[PDB]
């Protein structure tokens, strides 16, 4: 309780967050949140996802209209969660410094800035790239969605992300650090009664997920397609055997990154 | 309570209402007592656009039948004796 007294006494009220536009004061009106997390959504009766947003400035109110800066599409809000301790709660209206929940349907990512209009994006949020291994090949001898559905639902979350090549089967997953266990465990918890195990897979990279101008890409999506994959979220990626075979791939050139984006 | 209203039997974007006598308690396109004219909210400036058995309409009204606010705006929009 002292450290709490100390907490209340000394610790900052909502702080300014930086953006590629300006120092955003907490004092301002005009709503300005930024997600930051799409928690390991189980969740008792839904895919939900419910993206966790920070609220930098402005007051949120249930029926208000907001703007997803990234996709540049204006969105009306209604069901906007307030988390009473690892538990969804309906729902109120929020002030700077709180944490608000939404409802991810491939619309939200990580670092997705939401304003009331001001087109700008918060310079924060880390988002780094995975290492690898895997091939969940499942006991339960299938199905097949619930496993996959399970995987393409733990993947619009930030931890891991799957990789499904162009051979329907052969499911690859990659790969926070090495705790590929929550996957197995959420493969028989959350809402999927699958079981699943592992193997070793000839994949160093990771990969890195590409796109730019047409035609050239269709020649790329063809030549080194062996070899090329597609993700939960319907794009994109390669999947290489080593570092040399990674360099030569990009070296096919000159069409784009690198790209990780979680 | 017998009323004379319109049923939406047109098509996406291009409606085609149809005046009819029917117990109010019914579905728009539901059980009706009898067709009694139509109304084309399109048609364009050409040869036609509406039709009413006004001499039947008046028959039904004479039996205690209400009219749609829009059905009315037809009846008399097409005059009556000219």
């Amino acid at each position: 309780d002292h450290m709490l007294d100390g907490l209340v006494e000394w610790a900052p009220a909502p702080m300014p967050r930086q953006t590629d536009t300006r120092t955003v004061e907490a004092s301002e009106d005009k709503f300005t949140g930024f997600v930051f997390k799409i928690q390991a959504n189980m969740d008792p009766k839904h895919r939900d996802r419910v993206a966790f947003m920070r609220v930098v400035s402005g007051k949120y109110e249930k029926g208000m209209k907001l703007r997803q800066v990234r996709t540049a599409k204006d969105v009306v809000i209604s069901d906007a969660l307030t988390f009473m301790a690892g538990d969804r709660s309906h729902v109120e209206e929020a002030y700077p410094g709180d944490i608000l929940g939404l409802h991810n349907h491939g619309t939200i990512q990580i670092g997705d800035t939401f304003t009331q209009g001001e087109m700008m994006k918060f310079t924060g949020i880390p988002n780094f790239a995975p290492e690898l291994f895997r091939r969940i090949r499942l006991k339960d001898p299938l199905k097949q969605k619930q496993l996959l559905k399970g995987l393409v639902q733990l993947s619009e979350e930030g931890a891991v992300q799957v990789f499904r090549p162009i051979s329907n089967n052969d499911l690859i997953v990659g790969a926070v650090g090495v705790l590929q266990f929550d996957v197995v465990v959420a493969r028989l918890k959350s809402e999927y009664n699958v079981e699943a195990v592992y193997e070793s897979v000839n994949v160093a990279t990771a990969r890195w997920v590409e796109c730019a101008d047409a035609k050239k890409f269709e020649e790329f999506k063809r030549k080194n397609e062996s070899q090329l994959a597609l993700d939960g979220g319907d794009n994109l990626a390669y999947i290489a055997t080593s570092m040399v075979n990674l360099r030569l791939a990009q070296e096919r050139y000159p069409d784009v990154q690198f790209h990780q984006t979680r | 309570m017998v009323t004379i209203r319109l049923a939406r039997h047109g098509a996406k974007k291009r409606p085609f209402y149809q005046v009819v006598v029917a117990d109010s308690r019914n579905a728009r396109n539901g059980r009706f007592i009898e067709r009694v004219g139509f109304f084309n909210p399109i048609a364009s400036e050409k040869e036609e656009g509406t039709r009413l058995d006004l001499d039947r309409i008046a028959h039904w009204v004479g039996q205690g039948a209400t009219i749609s606010d829009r059905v009315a705006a037809l009846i008399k929009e097409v005059n009556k004796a000219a």
């Binding site: 450290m3 709490l4 009220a13 909502p14 690892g86 538990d87 410094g97 944490i99 931890a159 | -």
Partner: protein, 131 residues
């Protein structure tokens, strides 16, 4: 002192970090009874202090082993409205914790006085000075 800038100033949103098995989740459960959110309390793994009261480690596997991903909390203490995070200890496991720091204006580090400063304690300070 308008009803807007008043609500803003009385808020306070923070982390809770440390090295795996330090006290995050426990000190959190205790902070929750100082906020009248939990009328009793519990432990971890639902262990040594009996009663099906663990708790507030969201998930499931957490309650089987020990902690997984940031639970988030809002409660009133004294004259304030606290927003509380619960950051996972483990190298490979998070990530997340880092991204969670992006939502906090300040941060509380728990240290095992039986252990002193451990590895991810040192690594967490580096991440802290970033902001």
């Amino acid at each position: 002192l308008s009803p807007y800038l008043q609500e803003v100033a009385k808020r306070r949103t923070f982390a809770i970090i440390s090295h795996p098995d330090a006290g995050k989740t426990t000190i959190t459960e205790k902070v929750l009874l100082f906020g009248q959110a939990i009328q009793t309390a519990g432990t971890v793994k639902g262990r040594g202090s009996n009663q099906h009261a663990k708790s507030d480690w969201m998930e499931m596997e957490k309650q089987r082993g020990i902690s997984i991903t940031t639970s988030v909390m809002q409660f009133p203490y004294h004259d304030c409205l606290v927003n509380l995070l619960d950051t996972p200890g483990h190298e490979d496991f998070s990530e997340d914790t880092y991204r969670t720091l992006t939502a906090v204006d300040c941060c509380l580090m728990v240290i095992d006085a039986a252990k002193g400063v451990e590895d991810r304690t040192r690594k967490l300070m580096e991440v802290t000075r970033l902001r």
